[PDB]
Amino acid sequence: SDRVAQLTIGNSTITTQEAANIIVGYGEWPSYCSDSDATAVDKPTRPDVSVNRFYTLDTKLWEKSSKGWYWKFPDVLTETGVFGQNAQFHYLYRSGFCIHVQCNASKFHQGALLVAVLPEYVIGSVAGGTGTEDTHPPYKQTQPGADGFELQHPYVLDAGIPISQLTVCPHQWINLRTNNCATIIVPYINALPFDSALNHCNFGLLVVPISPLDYDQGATPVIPITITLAPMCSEFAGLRQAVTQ
Amino acid sequence: SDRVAQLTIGNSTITTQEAANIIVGYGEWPSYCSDSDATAVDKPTRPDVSVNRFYTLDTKLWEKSSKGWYWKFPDVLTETGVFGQNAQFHYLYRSGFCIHVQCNASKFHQGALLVAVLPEYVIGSVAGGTGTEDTHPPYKQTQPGADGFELQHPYVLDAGIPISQLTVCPHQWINLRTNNCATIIVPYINALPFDSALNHCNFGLLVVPISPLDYDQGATPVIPITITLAPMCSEFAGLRQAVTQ
Amino acid sequence: SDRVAQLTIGNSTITTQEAANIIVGYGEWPSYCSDSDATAVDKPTRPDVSVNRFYTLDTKLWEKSSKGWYWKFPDVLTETGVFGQNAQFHYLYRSGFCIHVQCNASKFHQGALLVAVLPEYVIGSVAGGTGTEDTHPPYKQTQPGADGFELQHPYVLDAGIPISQLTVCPHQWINLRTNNCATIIVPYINALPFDSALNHCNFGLLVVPISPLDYDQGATPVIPITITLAPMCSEFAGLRQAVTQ
Amino acid sequence: GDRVADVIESSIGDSVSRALTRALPAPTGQDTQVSSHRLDTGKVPALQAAEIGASSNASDESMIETRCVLNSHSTAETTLDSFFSRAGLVGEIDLPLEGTTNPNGYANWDIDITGYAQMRRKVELFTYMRFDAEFTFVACTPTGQVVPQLLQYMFVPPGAPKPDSRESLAWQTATNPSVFVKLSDPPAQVSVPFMSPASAYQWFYDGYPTFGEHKQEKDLEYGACPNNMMGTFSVRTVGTSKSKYPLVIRIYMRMKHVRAWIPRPMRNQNYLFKANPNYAGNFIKPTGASRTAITTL
Amino acid sequence: GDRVADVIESSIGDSVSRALTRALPAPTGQDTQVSSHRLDTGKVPALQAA
């Protein structure tokens, strides 16, 4: 009654038979912007089912020596489908999200993934190691796209913040012994009712294996991690010609 | 609450801990012939517990290259116990059935059995391959007895009918990953209120493995399939001397 | 709802996820001595939480050739903690018990333990084999302490009583396929409202493997058996200087 | 007084014994009700779990198709008094003329019912037994002949002086109860109450009676229950001179008003000693008979 | 007559055919009702058992 679940939105349906309940980010469901909070005067467009659907963006292979990966939102969808088209044609952006991470193994595999959502996850550079060099992460690292990016130092999350305290953010654990999926529902987290879907990344999703994957030789060595996500209550405003980046 | 079941009838009890619900053939429980449907004037005999009991008739070994088997009803019981004695001594026959197929394996075995009940399952011959020869199946093939008979061409069920459409008949699936038993309750299916239990076979039970059995070397290679069945609401009429065939 | 359980008493908590219900010895919960049953005139001391707690006394290794072990009560706790101190300082004794035997294995291990509580379990000697020698068991065998004692002839329980009838006493089965713990709650069983906690052993706990442990080579060969127990409604009376034995 | 919550709400002192079961009358065996074929899923009376330690509660109706039988078979004869209130041999006293055992014309028999397996196996089925006793003394010569001899049976409670001779001063029986009968008379029969200091006799006492080191010399004290030492039985031939006839005296005990507690497995090995569960170590025999193969009768 | 319980309470002779289903009129194809996004756990219409 809590291990089996089915999430349907738009024209896509995601099922699961070994779920571990659903986390609502900060105990708040996604909702449309209230008229007392909106600041733009133009009437926003609400395409509804054409954008509020589960997008399966990429598949990452979990290995015994993996460090972890992170994705930026809504960067991952800035170039995907009708949602990406609307985000390119419209200046303003507002939506929630429903992130479903899939990672399935057998009863003889072991390992634990920490799936967390960190708002305004600003990536820092290693500052040339010693710290005397004022470097900045490249565009391909600050906005990795749909491929995500592999963490270099997951202990500090490449941002000087320990991962041991990452659980203060909305998070779920994919421990292969019990559950093979993590569901996090994240409302719009920003200091503004609307923001640019290209320049600003509202939050970053982190998938870091805390307990290394292990299995005896002979079992299936390819354990993929697949990210599936669906915007919720998406709004757009400030239409103009399309902008690619 | 649906995986564990116990069927008791007569003086026999069959239990199961990995059941997959019970199929009532055509949504109709076996019942005695109504006085507005009966045509014979003699009072039928209803031996009740002496014939309405679970008979375990034979055990077939499922192999990775098995084609499938079928049994004819009530041929399988024409020579078994008090039921067979009554069927031999009485001209007329009427009963339902409760067929319980047992096929148990481990969690590392795989395969799927299609257990279906096809009324008036007339077996045809291969017509000499080309089809220019007007052959008929032998007595040992049209009335195989308690040993059943192995299908030669399970794709056409040795009768020119595709097995892909066999599921339109009352059927259950024995998929070794979940369930190890199939229960089908079949009422009397005939155009007559009574019929001869020797000459006419009301229906045929088919057990055909659709997905071949597989397992790594080392596991138990003998996976038996056992048929257990119990007539329901059996009636008999037209008593005379016993007739063996 | 019956397989998961948690027993908390005093400042100790014991949990279990593969329990097999709880046996109350002779259908009677431990209770304090009634004023119509008490015979001593001094006011008994009831230390409560300082003695009514789960004591983990020793760990025995189950092997494929093990014969069985038994413990004597409250001998096992005569030298353990505040309970042992009170039992040494006080002449009289009265308490119930809650015995929790832990024996955990994997789904590929097999074996069955019979955990029973036999009141006034008097140990006899082999009488020199032939029976012409009037021997008595040594002190280390009649009062084994916290280490228990390994049975020499578990068939007769070293007392001339068949183990096949041992199930008439409060008992539970640790069959590794289903459950990994046995819980027995034993009230005070004696012909006296109070008795000496040093001289008299109210009951003996028997852990005898009826079906030998087995597993294929490669699995974990060390299968420990751990006894955890908690006195219930303990009373003490007749305080004097401490007595060690 | 009580002001702290952990004391006010404390369950300490609750002396009521919560009993999950209550005795119900059952004069006859349980009736069998009508049952029919039952074909349902989810609910299964046949599959049980002896793992729990409880006897399976599946009934006849829940397994096979049964008829309606009104069982009027009485359960009276299996009760404790019906099972135990039958006199059986518990002790034998020999009074020879010339011998080494009792050549003095008297014999002291320490009261214990563990000397004969017939009685011992029955009584040893339960750990604690509380009952009255009725003792009958059948005396006769070794040839089974009755002779005109007058005897005295004395009950000697623990602590009373044990007679040491046929003319000892203890035979004055000024306080001890004594029975004077002749062999020609019917066997003497008296009723003995429950005299144990404990609330019930205990046949097995897993402990020691006194503190201290239990060395080899102080090793026979294991298993001896002072609460079962009901005293000594003294018998003598009433006279100053030696009796003319040799006598053997058999004492039969019959319990009544029996109450029993804590059933235990019934003995399956030959008894060796009084008040001792010792068994022949090398001669351990199976409880039942054996057969050549398990697949054949 | 009938005096034994196994005969008095017997279901022998019950000629009514217990039908778990009953025919319902369906002149046209079934209508499609409005549905919205549904994100809940424990309850799952998609997963079935053939």
Ligand SMILES: CCCCCCCCCCCCC/C=C/[C@H](O)[C@H](N)CO
């Ligand atoms: C004429 C006077 C006869 C007095 C009869 C007194 C009999 C009292 C009945 C119980 C006697 C004790 C029976 C044996 C108990 C224990 O098994 C043994 N003491 C073991 O140590």
